[PDB]
RNA sequence: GCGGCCCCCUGGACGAAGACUGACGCUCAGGUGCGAAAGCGUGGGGAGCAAACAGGAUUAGAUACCCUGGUAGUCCACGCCGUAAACGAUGUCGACUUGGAGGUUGUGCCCUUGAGGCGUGGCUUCCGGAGCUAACGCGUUAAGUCGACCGCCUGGGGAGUACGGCCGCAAGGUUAAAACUCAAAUGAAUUGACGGGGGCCCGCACAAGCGGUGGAGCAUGUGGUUUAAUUCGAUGCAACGCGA
RNA sequence: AAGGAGGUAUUCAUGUU
């Protein structure tokens, strides 16, 4: 409906899943897509190919805002983190900024205990 | 590598000199290791103190992303 | 093999047409060392196929091979978790071998009376993308695409 | 690692710069280290072991130049 | 044991040159104090994490490992507790005895010619010589060579347990046996064989193919059952169309 | 993830970037 032409794409790339959300410059979400919601479960949900498909579906979903210039904020140690960026560039957006926004504590809260597997 | 404080006779590094300190932080804003820069250990400690004092007074950023 | 270094056996071309592909096709179709029986089947099947299509025997045969040749298959990988189907591109030599094998298998599991007639009908179905041979080509392709996530 | 797209720079070239910038800031190594808590004793043990083996390999190498293998 | 930055109060160590006291020293049972974490008492505070616990899976079972939660606890103040693989598994003090490469912190000199050169102190890591070490090792920071003083050891199990005393709110701590039982327990190193340790390599071992076996009928061997007898042997691979 | 090269690794004007 409304026209923006400059958005921000946030890539939340976890070890298990990848969520791509395209927002306006002010933080208002226009649309979103997830690897786990694009038809992938478990061992396929945590793959770089699934992240590429999620970005494709989100771009197709945000089509009615006439976005032309996308900034990219990547967060997390995901198996994606790039497939998403290459797929946005392929889909047709003009990538103007690529920043990593991974939260690093300055020795804050204690992390969970190590898994004994 | 050669320390640039021993060769200049510098006694205290000083946190108010935001030209030398900018050479000794990275782009993200963290302090560069002495193993990379070739600074001596005595001046490394002084330099780390000066960078932390400058951060408190917001002469240097703590990180690249809070701004 | 392990100390690999195995070398390729050269195969003579067929007498009637001088094509290594046709010679290998006769070999794949041959059973129990009865090459004369197999050679008669291939020549009869090619003759009737060329009467139908109306092109050169070798050409019409090549136009069936083109529609059966696979472009990607799936091997299996025991490294990651031993459950991995990795799509891999097939080299051209193996493409011809797989196309011929599928054509012969489809022609055998048919309903016509004579093997020559079964083979001709399979080659026609391959040349118009409608037979069980071209069906297996498509089936392998879709399996590889479903495992494309594991291509890496 | 905040990479700005430069003029005429294709996407592959910019993406290589961004990937190297992150690998230079060591983000992924930091995250992997903070996934789970490790006791201070475990941390000290691991640090000391790496130093011992690193020193031993340097000394082993610096003596390997002494002799000929054939 | 101590890790952001700043301030306030405060302890020790080291170096330079000089002055001063004039053996004022070392060790130390008893005693006194400090002493991780868990725990205890009283009151706070509680984001994260997390015994117990609850649920979900895994499994023959799973009171576990894995997952989702989650209380005491972890934090503070004031008291207990007094213990750890509290380890360098190495008591403190002093003297003497070949070397090398470093780290860290002072200081002296020479041309600082420009991060240089040359010395002399403290602490510290790694190699190592003689000698010591059952051996591993150790080596001027000894586990060489000596001296002072204190702590401990006397086969393994029973047992750091019982009883008694002392200490503690408790948990317990500390001091500490015997009967009985065994002929060994043990430390280091050697040769193997192992490892759900590591590397390198090979074989129709796998993979790539072709044809089978397992289904049917029959031939044949074995097991079992049956019989008066169904003669005897081979019976994991490496017995079973085997002696035959 | 796989391979190659250099080292125990940098001095390598700044600037530009
Ligand atoms: Mg977890
Ligand atoms: Mg005493
Ligand atoms: Mg406590
Ligand atoms: Mg309490
Ligand atoms: Mg309370
Ligand atoms: Mg849990
Ligand atoms: Mg004790
Ligand atoms: Mg300790
Ligand atoms: Mg220790
Ligand atoms: Mg002891
Ligand atoms: Mg030694
Ligand atoms: Mg007791
Ligand atoms: Mg008692
Ligand atoms: Mg096989
Ligand atoms: Mg049978
Ligand atoms: Mg018998
Ligand atoms: Mg027998
Ligand atoms: Mg006998
Ligand atoms: Mg016998």
PDB file of C-alpha atoms in Angstrom, chain A residues 13-116:
ATOM      1  CA  UNK A  13      20.412 -16.195  12.263  1.00  0.00           C
ATOM      2  CA  UNK A  14      20.270 -18.709  15.102  1.00  0.00           C
ATOM      3  CA  UNK A  15      21.867 -22.129  15.085  1.00  0.00           C
ATOM      4  CA  UNK A  16      18.415 -23.652  14.643  1.00  0.00           C
ATOM      5  CA  UNK A  17      16.464 -21.177  12.524  1.00  0.00           C
ATOM      6  CA  UNK A  18      16.713 -17.976  10.503  1.00  0.00           C
ATOM      7  CA  UNK A  19      14.200 -15.122  10.647  1.00  0.00           C
ATOM      8  CA  UNK A  20      14.270 -12.349   8.048  1.00  0.00           C
ATOM      9  CA  UNK A  21      12.235  -9.221   8.756  1.00  0.00           C
ATOM     10  CA  UNK A  22      12.072  -6.150   6.519  1.00  0.00           C
ATOM     11  CA  UNK A  23      11.228  -2.946   8.375  1.00  0.00           C
ATOM     12  CA  UNK A  24      11.159   0.743   7.653  1.00  0.00           C
ATOM     13  CA  UNK A  25      14.034   2.983   8.717  1.00  0.00           C
ATOM     14  CA  UNK A  26      12.237   3.642  12.024  1.00  0.00           C
ATOM     15  CA  UNK A  27      11.791   0.016  13.083  1.00  0.00           C
ATOM     16  CA  UNK A  28       8.233  -0.687  11.907  1.00  0.00           C
ATOM     17  CA  UNK A  29       8.010  -4.231  10.544  1.00  0.00           C
ATOM     18  CA  UNK A  30       6.655  -4.451   7.008  1.00  0.00           C
ATOM     19  CA  UNK A  31       6.913  -8.231   6.576  1.00  0.00           C
ATOM     20  CA  UNK A  32       8.782 -11.286   7.755  1.00  0.00           C
ATOM     21  CA  UNK A  33       9.630 -14.863   6.848  1.00  0.00           C
ATOM     22  CA  UNK A  34      11.358 -17.756   8.579  1.00  0.00           C
ATOM     23  CA  UNK A  35      13.206 -20.825   7.368  1.00  0.00           C
ATOM     24  CA  UNK A  36      11.001 -22.978   9.590  1.00  0.00           C
ATOM     25  CA  UNK A  37       7.905 -21.408   8.080  1.00  0.00           C
ATOM     26  CA  UNK A  38       9.079 -21.770   4.488  1.00  0.00           C
ATOM     27  CA  UNK A  39       8.716 -25.555   4.583  1.00  0.00           C
ATOM     28  CA  UNK A  40      11.742 -26.874   6.469  1.00  0.00           C
ATOM     29  CA  UNK A  41      11.906 -28.838   9.723  1.00  0.00           C
ATOM     30  CA  UNK A  42      14.872 -29.744  11.911  1.00  0.00           C
ATOM     31  CA  UNK A  43      17.920 -30.836   9.932  1.00  0.00           C
ATOM     32  CA  UNK A  44      16.769 -28.792   6.928  1.00  0.00           C
ATOM     33  CA  UNK A  45      15.582 -25.784   8.938  1.00  0.00           C
ATOM     34  CA  UNK A  46      19.167 -25.126  10.108  1.00  0.00           C
ATOM     35  CA  UNK A  47      20.704 -25.076   6.619  1.00  0.00           C
ATOM     36  CA  UNK A  48      21.959 -22.148   4.524  1.00  0.00           C
ATOM     37  CA  UNK A  49      19.620 -23.094   1.686  1.00  0.00           C
ATOM     38  CA  UNK A  50      16.609 -22.679   3.976  1.00  0.00           C
ATOM     39  CA  UNK A  51      17.829 -19.186   4.866  1.00  0.00           C
ATOM     40  CA  UNK A  52      18.032 -18.274   1.181  1.00  0.00           C
ATOM     41  CA  UNK A  53      14.432 -19.397   0.641  1.00  0.00           C
ATOM     42  CA  UNK A  54      13.258 -17.421   3.678  1.00  0.00           C
ATOM     43  CA  UNK A  55      14.789 -14.236   2.266  1.00  0.00           C
ATOM     44  CA  UNK A  56      13.146 -14.879  -1.111  1.00  0.00           C
ATOM     45  CA  UNK A  57       9.715 -15.295   0.482  1.00  0.00           C
ATOM     46  CA  UNK A  58      10.116 -12.165   2.606  1.00  0.00           C
ATOM     47  CA  UNK A  59      11.123 -10.119  -0.449  1.00  0.00           C
ATOM     48  CA  UNK A  60       8.102 -11.438  -2.343  1.00  0.00           C
ATOM     49  CA  UNK A  61       5.930 -10.528   0.663  1.00  0.00           C
ATOM     50  CA  UNK A  62       7.249  -6.950   0.969  1.00  0.00           C
ATOM     51  CA  UNK A  63       6.705  -6.323  -2.744  1.00  0.00           C
ATOM     52  CA  UNK A  64       3.803  -3.881  -2.301  1.00  0.00           C
ATOM     53  CA  UNK A  65       5.882  -1.229  -0.519  1.00  0.00           C
ATOM     54  CA  UNK A  66       8.084  -0.448  -3.533  1.00  0.00           C
ATOM     55  CA  UNK A  67      11.316  -0.876  -1.589  1.00  0.00           C
ATOM     56  CA  UNK A  68      14.413  -0.121  -3.651  1.00  0.00           C
ATOM     57  CA  UNK A  69      17.321   0.336  -1.195  1.00  0.00           C
ATOM     58  CA  UNK A  70      17.894  -2.125   1.649  1.00  0.00           C
ATOM     59  CA  UNK A  71      20.210  -1.981   4.624  1.00  0.00           C
ATOM     60  CA  UNK A  72      21.202  -5.297   6.184  1.00  0.00           C
ATOM     61  CA  UNK A  73      21.711  -5.987   9.896  1.00  0.00           C
ATOM     62  CA  UNK A  74      22.895  -9.544  10.560  1.00  0.00           C
ATOM     63  CA  UNK A  75      22.694 -11.030  14.050  1.00  0.00           C
ATOM     64  CA  UNK A  76      23.738 -14.433  15.335  1.00  0.00           C
ATOM     65  CA  UNK A  77      26.061 -17.336  14.532  1.00  0.00           C
ATOM     66  CA  UNK A  78      23.654 -18.934  12.097  1.00  0.00           C
ATOM     67  CA  UNK A  79      24.326 -21.356   9.264  1.00  0.00           C
ATOM     68  CA  UNK A  80      22.827 -18.695   7.023  1.00  0.00           C
ATOM     69  CA  UNK A  81      24.165 -15.129   7.481  1.00  0.00           C
ATOM     70  CA  UNK A  82      25.126 -14.890   3.804  1.00  0.00           C
ATOM     71  CA  UNK A  83      22.652 -16.956   1.798  1.00  0.00           C
ATOM     72  CA  UNK A  84      20.148 -14.354   2.959  1.00  0.00           C
ATOM     73  CA  UNK A  85      22.301 -11.463   1.752  1.00  0.00           C
ATOM     74  CA  UNK A  86      23.072 -13.080  -1.594  1.00  0.00           C
ATOM     75  CA  UNK A  87      19.373 -13.844  -2.022  1.00  0.00           C
ATOM     76  CA  UNK A  88      18.313 -10.265  -1.308  1.00  0.00           C
ATOM     77  CA  UNK A  89      20.892  -9.071  -3.832  1.00  0.00           C
ATOM     78  CA  UNK A  90      19.540 -11.627  -6.303  1.00  0.00           C
ATOM     79  CA  UNK A  91      15.905 -10.738  -5.576  1.00  0.00           C
ATOM     80  CA  UNK A  92      16.630  -7.206  -6.692  1.00  0.00           C
ATOM     81  CA  UNK A  93      17.277  -4.850  -3.801  1.00  0.00           C
ATOM     82  CA  UNK A  94      20.195  -2.435  -3.877  1.00  0.00           C
ATOM     83  CA  UNK A  95      22.154  -3.403  -0.771  1.00  0.00           C
ATOM     84  CA  UNK A  96      23.535  -0.171   0.663  1.00  0.00           C
ATOM     85  CA  UNK A  97      24.889  -1.219   4.074  1.00  0.00           C
ATOM     86  CA  UNK A  98      25.977  -4.493   5.684  1.00  0.00           C
ATOM     87  CA  UNK A  99      26.501  -4.336   9.454  1.00  0.00           C
ATOM     88  CA  UNK A 100      26.852  -7.106  12.023  1.00  0.00           C
ATOM     89  CA  UNK A 101      24.730  -6.438  15.099  1.00  0.00           C
ATOM     90  CA  UNK A 102      25.456  -9.572  17.142  1.00  0.00           C
ATOM     91  CA  UNK A 103      24.916  -8.876  20.874  1.00  0.00           C
ATOM     92  CA  UNK A 104      28.124  -9.430  22.845  1.00  0.00           C
ATOM     93  CA  UNK A 105      27.920  -9.134  26.642  1.00  0.00           C
ATOM     94  CA  UNK A 106      30.776  -7.373  28.364  1.00  0.00           C
ATOM     95  CA  UNK A 107      30.721 -10.266  30.848  1.00  0.00           C
ATOM     96  CA  UNK A 108      27.114  -9.963  31.871  1.00  0.00           C
ATOM     97  CA  UNK A 109      24.927 -12.929  32.775  1.00  0.00           C
ATOM     98  CA  UNK A 110      26.154 -16.474  33.391  1.00  0.00           C
ATOM     99  CA  UNK A 111      25.515 -18.786  30.412  1.00  0.00           C
ATOM    100  CA  UNK A 112      23.924 -22.238  30.757  1.00  0.00           C
ATOM    101  CA  UNK A 113      25.931 -25.300  31.666  1.00  0.00           C
ATOM    102  CA  UNK A 114      27.859 -27.288  29.091  1.00  0.00           C
ATOM    103  CA  UNK A 115      26.055 -30.203  27.485  1.00  0.00           C
ATOM    104  CA  UNK A 116      27.411 -33.671  28.243  1.00  0.00           C
TER     105      UNK A 116
END
